[PDB]
From Swiss-Prot, chain B:
It holds the Pfam family Ribosomal_L37ae. It comes from Plasmodium falciparum (isolate 3D7). This is Large ribosomal subunit protein eL43. PANTHER family: 60S RIBOSOMAL PROTEIN L37A, LARGE RIBOSOMAL SUBUNIT PROTEIN EL43. One of its GO terms (biological process) is translation. The keyword Zinc-finger applies. Component of the large ribosomal subunit. Mature ribosomes consist of a small (40S) and a large (60S) subunit. The 40S subunit contains about 32 different proteins and 1 molecule of RNA (18S). The 60S subunit contains about 42 different proteins and 3 molecules of RNA (28S, 5.8S and 5S).
Amino acid sequence: AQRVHYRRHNHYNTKSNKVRPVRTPGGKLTIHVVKKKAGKPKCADCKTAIQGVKALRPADNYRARRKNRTVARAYGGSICARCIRERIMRAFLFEEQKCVRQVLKE
Amino acid sequence: SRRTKKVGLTGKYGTRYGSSLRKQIKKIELMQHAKYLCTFCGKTATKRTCVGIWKCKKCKRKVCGGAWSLTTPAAVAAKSTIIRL
Amino acid sequence: GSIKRFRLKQRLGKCRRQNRPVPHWYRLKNTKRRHWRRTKLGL
Amino acid sequence: PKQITDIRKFLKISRKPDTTAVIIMKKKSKTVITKLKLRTKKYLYTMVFADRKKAERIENSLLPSLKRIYYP
Amino acid sequence: RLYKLAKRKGRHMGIGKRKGTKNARTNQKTLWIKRQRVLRRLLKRLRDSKKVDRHLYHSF
Amino acid sequence: GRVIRGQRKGRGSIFKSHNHHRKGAAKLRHLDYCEKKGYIKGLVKDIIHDPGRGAPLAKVIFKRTEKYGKKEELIIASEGMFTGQYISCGTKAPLSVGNILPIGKMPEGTLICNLEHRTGNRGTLVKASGCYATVVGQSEDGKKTKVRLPSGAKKTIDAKARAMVGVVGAGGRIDKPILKAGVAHHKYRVKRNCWPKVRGVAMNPVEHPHGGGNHQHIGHPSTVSRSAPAGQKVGLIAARRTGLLRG
RNA sequence: GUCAACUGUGAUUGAACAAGAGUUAGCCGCUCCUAAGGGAUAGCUGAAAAGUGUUUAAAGGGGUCCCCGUCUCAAAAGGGAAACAGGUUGAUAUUCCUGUGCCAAUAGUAUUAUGAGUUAGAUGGUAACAUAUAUAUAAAUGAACUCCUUUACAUAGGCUUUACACUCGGGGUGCGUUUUCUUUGCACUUUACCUUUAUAACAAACCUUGGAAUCAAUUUACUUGGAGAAGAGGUUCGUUGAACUCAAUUCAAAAAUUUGUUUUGUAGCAAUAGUAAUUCGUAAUUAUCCGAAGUGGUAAGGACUAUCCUUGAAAAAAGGAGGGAACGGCUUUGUGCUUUGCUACUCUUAAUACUUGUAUGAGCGUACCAACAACCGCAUCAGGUCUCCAAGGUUAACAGCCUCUGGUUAAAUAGAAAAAAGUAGGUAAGGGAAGUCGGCAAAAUAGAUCCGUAACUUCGGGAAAAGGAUUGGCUCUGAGGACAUUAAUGUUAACUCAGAACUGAAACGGACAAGGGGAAUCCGACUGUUUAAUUAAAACAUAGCAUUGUGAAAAGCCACAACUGGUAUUAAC
């Protein structure tokens, strides 16, 4: 076949240096170092990835259009829909329950 | 079909080690991987994830527990004693 | 190695320069000489 | 490199100041077809013209001052 | 290519010609998985086409 | 000879604690007005493991008493407590599992942990897995309180020292035997270099007082005085008695 | 160039000698961040030298008088702004050249143009959530103060998806064998970054509806469900990176701009570039560059499951949200504020002009060897020395044997002769351990399928026990799938199994590969480890058992001259 070799001045097979064989239009089989796969961004309460938000690294998250980073809805790309829904309910329910309790108490 | 007359869970250790030693391990391991009933939901999904830490799969909630069980008898007696007052 | 620090590179050049034999017209008016293989620079 | 589809958008780029060059290329495939490439400093935009008559009229239509390259 | 055409025609799979354990010759696990997929595939078609009842499907 | 194996262990070189994955110290919420005069309720947000000890650690959030917003502490977890439990701390806190109360306000015969050996010290007795202390009495003029540490000694502390209602987590840990050497290797790997042990009598004389001879015999008494000097302290240190137990 | 010496033989050679020459980066690194840690500051000790690192700190920054807060070094394999293809030289190239991009800066002031909002903060969507396509997706008010998240992580096992690799068949080119046979054997048939790449596809997750026991759905694996399943319709991330009629176009049927049918384009990048050919000058042309599929060797991902008295770094840096501080422009009486008069204003990219020190990309590395002669071993020393790439046949096989790409055909010598002896090997009639301290050495065995398998046992094992049989080549037979037509009828894929003939000097795991076994005793439970260059063991370690001190900073145990430390980010399990 053909063989490949590192071109980027650090040849060890470390997690950030993983490498993908690719053929050139020169008919040469060459090597490319593919970027690191990145974690999904997670809800504050439940540590679970949130819809719409792209999983971009701290370099790529800076360059993308703003719409990719967040959700037009309450605590956006920082709390998920299920938790927010439950939280909104708590915020009403306890406030009523507290007022009732005070009225009862006197 | 029925693999072992005795050994069960501790069969992994094989011909090595004392039978008495192995028996003592067998009781604790049977207890260890046992699925506890989760009193935050009513499913039998509570498992041990690390030495003292018990997670329910359904509730995604961490109960603090014993080394080899969800509840040690010492704690149960203490809990009851508190409850009575 | 491939890489060097600048002081080290400059020094390696200095040694190389030092080797260069005595100029031929001067003899018409040597004893000390680095050779690479068996006589390491060490520095 | 970017691919244009709208003839009007192509014309719109064509009028503008930083659109330095028009790079035009015509070739066989099986019959003749035309690739029209425009060179803006920011990008090289390409439009694929499948009919000679349209291509001929548009190549004529352009502002003539704008630089012209043929590959051969 | 000639040898391979002959192997297709079944000519060198005899007991002496083999040189490895049966599981190494072909993996038992893969064979099972193949078979389970064939049986599941048939069942999904039978339920989708509505030519069995759900209850019968589940038992099968 | 040369420095003996016991002495080398102390000296602050390689035998320093295996720091690296430890999650930070476990010490109670420090004493303030808000606790002293009442109660403060906090949230357990998480229970997290620790490479050092059997007990899990409990991630506790309070809201600050003189500044906006939430501040996180690490408490050592009582058995039977849980994520999303409200944890209460203070003089008026109710007797209930995993709350933090002054020992002066315990009813007798309660089981507790996280004793402060002297007040305000953020908890320093009863922290290892499955331990507990028992409260055994309150003096007539109050002010002092009598408790029992799990070793078997009775001790008298100030009343306003903290403790935590309920037994320490991870009970029964040494019930399970360690079957194979590698498990023991892994146990010590996250603690301190102290293992495998090496029998002193098998050493050369130069390294240790039991060394030498031709049958690995101890060759002189195995009990050495409390008064013994540094390199001499060998086998059974200052022992009251030797041989099997009775009570 | 060249042969004084060296290149252990020769030598016109050469890693020798001589003369010149060569290393080009915003993107590849260093450079920045923190880790194990190091060195200092405050103290304090100490004659000093030094030993300590917040232990009596008026100490480094952020907001605009308040709030944070040791400094500094320590990764060329952790974290980490951004780059690829082709070509080119005697010697460099992700660095020069040509093309194409990408990333980061990009001051003030004034003009212009780009779109927003307004008569001080847009809309859609039931929802999950979606929305700016401007030469450019620029632009969707937001202070203090907060709260998160990404950065950012173990191991094992399988499953699955894509990529590359390999293979097969067909068309096209060239070449080869071509006595005989050979619709043949072989070669070539190329496609990058970049375009939030456009879409499709798929594992999940989530939503709307729906209301489930004769439980259901369901994976290789088990998982999941009234805390809402199946079903039906959706929304998103992640893989992927032109899949899919994708886009453009055409005609037919539509709405005051859609569905159906056709034509194009290797989706742009892209053929002008490569490669194989073919001619003519002696540079120029022409022709080619594409229809089906399989194997699963690599690598990445996905969804997962299991394992742990082990739970598997940190920050720099970036992002999101909570919160609601601040808020037209112009003219003007009066002390940024108040009342009068007027309406195109506030944002925001990009370009331009002018001033402001000279207003775009700093410095350093980049030759060559990397051992076979460039390293270390006193040297051109059969030694030692870190990482990635991984072709065909045979095969369990990245083994061993032979082969293609690529490399070499040289080793501190050659020829001729051929004896003892040596050394690395073969092989031996008949006997079969009689040799020897000692079956040491050597040999026998061995691959697989099918059978058969004891004492004893902690019931797990012993066990491949022991002990048998079979195995080639040929010619057949049976078994095992996938699709799509309206039960039958068709198209169509692999390799593995099982059975039967015939055939031969009874041979066939033919080479290579590859267990000697049994009956007992002694010691050591075991796996583990050790005397580097005389001892691998019965020594040592180990789990378990047993013992002892110690309740704490006036303690245990231990280090230090001293102050001070360590065990201790600890606490009787």
